[PDB]
Structure 1
Amino acid sequence: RMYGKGKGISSSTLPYKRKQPSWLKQKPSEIEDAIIKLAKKGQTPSQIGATLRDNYGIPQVKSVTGNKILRILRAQGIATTIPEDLYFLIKKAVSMRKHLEKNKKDKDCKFRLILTESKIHRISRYYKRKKLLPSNWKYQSSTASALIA
């Protein structure tokens, strides 16, 4: 774990079968359109995959079609300018700062906000080392509330 203690090995393990499940006679001719419609209706790719697994019964979009969900979203041009995890971290930091402004006596909240901003800086450094984020992206803490956009 990045901060604190606890190994917490809870996760999801993909099946050995890499290919599309045999019982799925469904055709991949419209699964990408389904995810595109879902993203248009407004869903982050994580919950797009979750909704696809639950309500559509088509696990491992990568197995159904040899291309992964955020990748097809980018290929269609729908993908957001800020990656999902970084945006969620920014939202958490914005909420925490909004709370702290009212309660400056919340030392624990201040500490965890420092931790969250450290994570934000590390992951933004990674994303701008890749070309997934503009080189001038900084995350100043003043206008992050509207930076979600």
Structure 2
Amino acid sequence: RMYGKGKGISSSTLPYKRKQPSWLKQKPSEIEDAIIKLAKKGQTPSQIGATLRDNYGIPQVKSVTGNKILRILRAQGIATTIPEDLYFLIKKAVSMRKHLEKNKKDKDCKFRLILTESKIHRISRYYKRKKLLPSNWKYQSSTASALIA
């Protein structure tokens, strides 16, 4: 684990066969449409994937549709400006900051806030290095709260 002393290995691990299984009836177009609908309804990539797995009969959008789900969202144009994980981190940070504002003496929270900030800065940096974030994007503790939306 990047920050704790946590060393767990709980993980999804996908099956050997990566051409979709026989029982999968859904044609790709339908699944794409479903994905789009889910996106519209406010769900994030991971969440969307989960929904697809559970509510509909489909293991992996990658086996049914050549593309992964983020890619298809992008194609359809409903991709977030601000990437999933990063966004989540930002939200968490914001929450922490609110708590701090409320409740000044919380040392552990402060420590954890610092850690989350650091992680954001890593993630943020990575995104900048690609082209998902713009280069003009620092993350600010003052702004942050407004950013998430």
Alpha-carbon shift at residue 25 of structure 1 (Å):
2.3
C-alpha distance in structure 2 between counterparts of 1:29 and 1:84, whole Å: 24
Alignment root-mean-square deviation, CA: 0.7
Alpha-carbon shift at residue 117 of structure 1 (Å):
0.1
Aligned-partner SS, 2:29: coil
The superposition leaves residues 121-142 of structure 1 with CA deviations (integer Å, 9 ceiling, x where unpaired) of 0100000000111010110110
C-alpha distance in structure 1 between counterparts of 2:23 and 2:125, whole Å: 43
Aligned-partner SS, 1:30: helix
Alpha-carbon shift at residue 6 of structure 1 (Å):
2.1
Q: TM-score, normalised by structure 1?
A: 0.98
Alpha-carbon shift at residue 75 of structure 1 (Å):
0.6
% identical equivalent positions: 100
Alpha-carbon shift at residue 26 of structure 1 (Å):
2.2
C-alpha distance in structure 1 between counterparts of 2:25 and 2:44, whole Å: 27
C-alpha distance in structure 1 between counterparts of 2:18 and 2:83, whole Å: 26
C-alpha distance in structure 1 between counterparts of 2:96 and 2:112, whole Å: 9
User: 5+ residue gaps in structure 2?
Assistant: none
Alpha-carbon shift at residue 23 of structure 1 (Å):
1.0
Alpha-carbon shift at residue 29 of structure 1 (Å):
2.3
Partner of 1:88: 88
C-alpha distance in structure 1 between counterparts of 2:25 and 2:76, whole Å: 25
The superposition leaves residues 55-111 of structure 1 with CA deviations (integer Å, 9 ceiling, x where unpaired) of 001011000111000000001110000000000000000000000111110000000
C-alpha distance in structure 2 between counterparts of 1:82 and 1:36, whole Å: 18
C-alpha distance in structure 1 between counterparts of 2:26 and 2:102, whole Å: 53
Alpha-carbon shift at residue 4 of structure 1 (Å):
1.5
User: 5+ residue gaps in structure 1?
Assistant: none
C-alpha distance in structure 2 between counterparts of 1:49 and 1:71, whole Å: 13
C-alpha distance in structure 2 between counterparts of 1:38 and 1:4, whole Å: 34
Partner of 1:18: 18
C-alpha distance in structure 2 between counterparts of 1:26 and 1:106, whole Å: 52
C-alpha distance in structure 1 between counterparts of 2:95 and 2:54, whole Å: 30
